[PDB]
Amino acid sequence: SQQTRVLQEKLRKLKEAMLCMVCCEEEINSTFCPCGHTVCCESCAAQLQSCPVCRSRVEHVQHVYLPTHTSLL
Amino acid sequence: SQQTRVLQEKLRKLKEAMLCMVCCEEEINSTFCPCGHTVCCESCAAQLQSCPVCRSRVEHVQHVYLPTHT
Ligand SMILES: Cc1nc(-c2cccc(N)c2)no1
Ligand SMILES: [Zn+2]
Ligand SMILES: [Zn+2]
Ligand SMILES: [Zn+2]
Ligand SMILES: [Zn+2]
């Protein structure tokens, strides 16, 4: 029905919000510190000296173990 | 249709996985450091001495701004 298509869209948008904002291909699993923006995968976060959301300097990157994480397994 | 019900369930489960493992009422927005477990809201994370997932000592709590926040 039309509601099947609406639910498909909601699910797709929620899953897209879980993906790295830079590469769009890998799940978010890293936090820029100290600002706290958690919007990248580990590969993109290692290459940024400034937060892509707020432009604060990145002192270091903290890996995050989230419950929403999914993998090939 | 039955497909609408299947998608409703997938959405519900993903949203439930984003809630604090202690209170089950507030969204996750805090990380235990240095272990990195990000499973609690700010209120529940504030008084824990050890991580509720892996038992590592909590040196500090880092607030996280996630794109899934609603
Ligand atoms: C809340 C909340 N958001 C997430 C989240 C956000 C982006 C990516 C991933 N994997 C999880 N988990 O809990
Ligand atoms: Zn990336
Ligand atoms: Zn930032
Ligand atoms: Zn809580
Ligand atoms: Zn832990």
How many inter-chain contacts (A to B, CB under 8 Å) are there?
A: 76
Closest listed residue to residue A57, CA positions, set A38, A73, A28, A35: A35
A69 within domain boundaries: no
DSSP collapsed to 3 states, A19-68 = ECCCCCCCECCEEEECCCECCECHHHHHCCCECCCCCCECCEEEECECCC
Q: Which residues in A lie closer than 8 A to residue B15 (C-beta atoms)?
A: 14
Domain span holding position A12? 2-63
Q: Domain holding B32: CATH number?
A: 3.30.40.10
- Which residues, at least 6 apart from A35, have a Cβ–Cβ distance to it below 8 Å? A51, A53, A54, A56, A58, B65
DSSP 8-state assignment for residue B60? E
Judging contacts by C-beta atoms under 8 Å, the chain B residues touching residue A68 are 14, 17-18, 68
Q: Which amino acid, B26?
A: E
Tell me the one-letter amino acid at A30: S
**What distances in angstroms separate CA A67 from CA A15, A27, B39, B46, B55, one per listed residue?**
14, 12, 7, 19, 17
Residue A57 lies in a domain: yes
Is A38 exposed, middle or buried, given 0-12, 13-18 or 19+ CB atoms closer than 10 A? buried
* A36 occurs within a structural domain: yes
Asked whether residue B18 is domain-assigned, the answer is: yes
- Resolution reached, in Å? 1.6
Experimental method: X-ray
How many folded domains does chain A comprise?
1
B68 domain-assigned: no
Closest residue in chain A to residue B70, using alpha carbons only = A14
What tokens were used for A56? 């604060």
Residue B21, domain member (yes or no): yes
Report residue A61 as tokens. Answer: 């990157």
Say how far apart CA A36 and CA A53 lie, in whole Å: 10
CB contact under 8 A, B35 and A8: no
Which 3 state secondary structure label does DSSP give B28?
Answer: coil
Residue B6 lies in a domain: yes
Give the type of residue at A23: C
In a domain, A68, yes or no: no
Residue listed under structure tokens 């419950």: A67
d(CA A53, CA B66): 11
